[PDB]
């Protein structure tokens, strides 16, 4: 029973963007534009069900070029949503259909919400080499796209999950970096080493699902879930670190992550969602970090045996990024480092007698080496089993004073706010049911005024704006109970309701005494 700003879309919502006081939703067959203040629908754009034909390419008049009778409508599920501000501000969207190509929508000055005025597909054929397609960006089987401007150009780091049927005719790249041409009419690969693929024999036996991707300390990181080796049937999570100099893939390394619960020790080896944030003072001194350091917060789950499907058993681990980099640079020796098993062959010339140069942490060479670690980076659960019997599916993080607070969403559709601390009871101070649908890991956190912002959370066809503070009060129904709230929530009794002083508009707000009746 919570009155919150929400919006329904009549189709599932994939990715979401916040930019210039407008909220951009990338939903199945549509792109919605809502006003940030009230989540009222302002603009629409129909990327709706589209007809596919081999002789038809993006931006073409397909109805005049080919025979379209009996065509099966294909639903265009959004896959990537990006906003560019380097040049003229625009919105790049990548869908699942039409070879996974992307399109851009340009914003006018007088009106910053015209997404249907100037739209250019980003596609250019390759008549010279008919097998190469740098504009085929996104796999419909799962893709994670991270864009960044560097050296006066726009770069697209893409992780794609590949089915074996793509490889024969329509192939994609497991990890790639594409540069947007200055004419904004196509991507390009600068070298043979701008992309790393899985061997054709391992397209089926070695799936790779890309969970997260971020940039930190002039490095690109990709959180993914793979098989531990090749002949094994168990799955685990790896973090992937690489450098990008002049749009290249240099110093590529994969390192396994392990989130254990010592209460012998069970491992939660499947990442469900992550979020990089800086810590509050308490947690910071609890994990040997500084206030300005980037921490990777991860929500893990335990795998059903010999599978990558997680059961309703979750955990939460913190990985300071500086400790990750130091683990890359120090643990390396003559036994932990390995060759990339799915990139090269298991029996390759490089996988036998080539070592990472010690002249190196980010150098670009003509013959780049791509490695894979044996020893994992382990951390203990910070909730210590509190969520060891549910499936967490969303996480974000903010700071209230010296406290680091985590926003969690579950498989059952529950939203909850908890305080993250190793020494202390990890008991959620906020806990309710957003929707019957699972909570999507794609979320937003926006800070306004003094640490009093909000977070956008997605469930099914609905997205809700949830305030970062004051929800712990709104479930108490008596002043004698409103007085017992934990001190950091700053609750008080407003005549008939329990809120914080900001939400008590008129009347009396008390936080000291309460006078019950007998």
């Amino acid at each position: 029973k919570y009155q919150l700003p929400n919006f329904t879309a009549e189709t599932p919502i994939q990715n979401v963007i916040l930019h210039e006081h407008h909220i951009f939703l990338g939903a199945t067959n549509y792109i919605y534009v809502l006003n940030e203040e009230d989540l009222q629908k302002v603009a629409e754009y129909k990327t709706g069900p589209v007809l596919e034909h081999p002789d038809c390419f993006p931006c073409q008049d397909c109805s005049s070029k080919a025979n379209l009778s009996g065509g099966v409508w294909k639903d265009n599920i959004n896959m990537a949503l990006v906003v560019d501000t380097y040049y003229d501000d625009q919105l790049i969207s990548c869908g699942s259909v039409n070879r996974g190509t992307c399109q851009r929508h340009v914003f006018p000055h007088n009106h910053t919400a015209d997404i249907q005025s100037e739209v250019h597909c980003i596609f250019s054929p390759q008549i010279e080499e008919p097998s190469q397609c740098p504009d085929c960006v996104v796999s419909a089987l799962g893709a994670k796209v991270l864009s960044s401007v560097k050296d006066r150009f726009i770069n697209f780091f893409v992780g794609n999950t590949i089915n074996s049927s793509y490889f024969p005719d329509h192939p994609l790249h497991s990890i790639s970096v594409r540069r947007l041409k200055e004419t904004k009419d196509g991507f390009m690969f600068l070298t043979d080493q701008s992309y790393i693929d899985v061997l054709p024999e391992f397209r089926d036996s070695y799936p790779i699902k890309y969970v997260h991707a971020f940039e930190s300390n002039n490095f690109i990181y990709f959180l993914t879930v793979q098989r531990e080796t090749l002949d094994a049937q168990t799955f685990h999570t790896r973090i992937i670190r690489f450098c990008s100099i002049n749009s290249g893939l240099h110093s590529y390394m994969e390192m396994p992550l392990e989130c254990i619960l010592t209460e012998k020790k069970e491992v939660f080896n499947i990442l469900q969602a992550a979020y990089v944030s800086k810590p509050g003072a308490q947690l910071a001194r609890q994990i040997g970090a500084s206030l300005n350091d980037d921490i990777l917060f991860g929500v893990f789950a335990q795998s059903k045996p010999d599978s990558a499907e997680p059961m309703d058993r979750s955990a939460m681990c913190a990985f300071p990024i500086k400790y990750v980099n130091d683990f890359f640079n120090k643990i390396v020796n003559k036994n932990n480092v390995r060759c990339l098993q799915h990139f090269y062959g298991p029996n390759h010339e490089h996988c036998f007698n080539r070592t990472l140069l010690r002249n190196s942490g980010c150098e670009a060479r003509r013959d780049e080496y791509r490695t894979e670690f044996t020893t994992a980076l382990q951390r203990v659960d910070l909730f210590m089993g509190q969520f060891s019997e549910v499936l967490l599916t969303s996480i974000s993080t903010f700071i209230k004073g010296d406290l680091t607070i985590a926003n969690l969403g579950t498989s059952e559709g529950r939203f909850m706010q908890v305080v993250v601390s190793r020494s202390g009871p990890s008991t959620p101070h906020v806990n309710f049911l957003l929707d019957s649908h699972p909570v999507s890991p794609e979320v937003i956190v926006e800070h306004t005024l003094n640490q009093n912002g909000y977070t956008l959370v997605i469930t099914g066809k609905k997205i809700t704006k949830i305030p970062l503070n004051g929800l712990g009060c709104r479930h108490f129904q008596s002043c004698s109970q409103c007085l017992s709230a934990p001190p950091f929530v700053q609750c008080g009794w407003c005549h008939d309701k329990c809120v914080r002083s900001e939400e008590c508009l008129s009347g009396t707000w008390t936080q000291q005494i309460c006078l019950p009746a007998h």
Partner: antibody
Amino acid sequence: QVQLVQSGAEVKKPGASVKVSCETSGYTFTSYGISWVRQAPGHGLEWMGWISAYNGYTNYAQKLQGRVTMTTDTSTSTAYMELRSLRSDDTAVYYCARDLRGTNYFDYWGQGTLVTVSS
Amino acid sequence: DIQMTQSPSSVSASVGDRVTITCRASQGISNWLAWFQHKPGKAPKLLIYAASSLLSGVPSRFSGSGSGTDFTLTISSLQPEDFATYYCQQANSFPITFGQGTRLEIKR
């Protein structure tokens, strides 16, 4: 060497028809489409039609009153064009070009044949 | 039908000059546009496809620009081998339509 080799020049009387051939070599034939483009003395290029050997799809210009008929032999990888009800307007040079399927980007051409229509 | 409009119809330049031919599309064709160089006695030579993508072997001095309905072909420093009749073609819809051409002539 990827080459398109058209037939010889031809002279026809008005009312009759003409059939021009275009033998291609150097690539998998079905993987590309064949378009036809003619040019009359004193005029520029004019698209006549496109044919896809894969699908058998054909599209002709409404300016030609449906007098055009394009065919394709895949086993020999040759294209054929037929223009019926010839008028003096149709005296021109006919070119046979290839494109990467639906791209309509004509990389390699034929040498072009001269077709002369006059009484 | 969708109409292409080249400009100018004919222009004369010396060796070492920049020459630009503009093409105007009736409807938005995105970047489905090609430029052709046509010399007497031979077939048209494809120079630039996808509005700005150069074919292998075409010199660097040829440059393509434009998107939607306005397009531009640019030769930075002309050379004798570059004087010909240039054509503007679309690749967006049927019927496929060309431009009226542009004659390039040496100035003496």
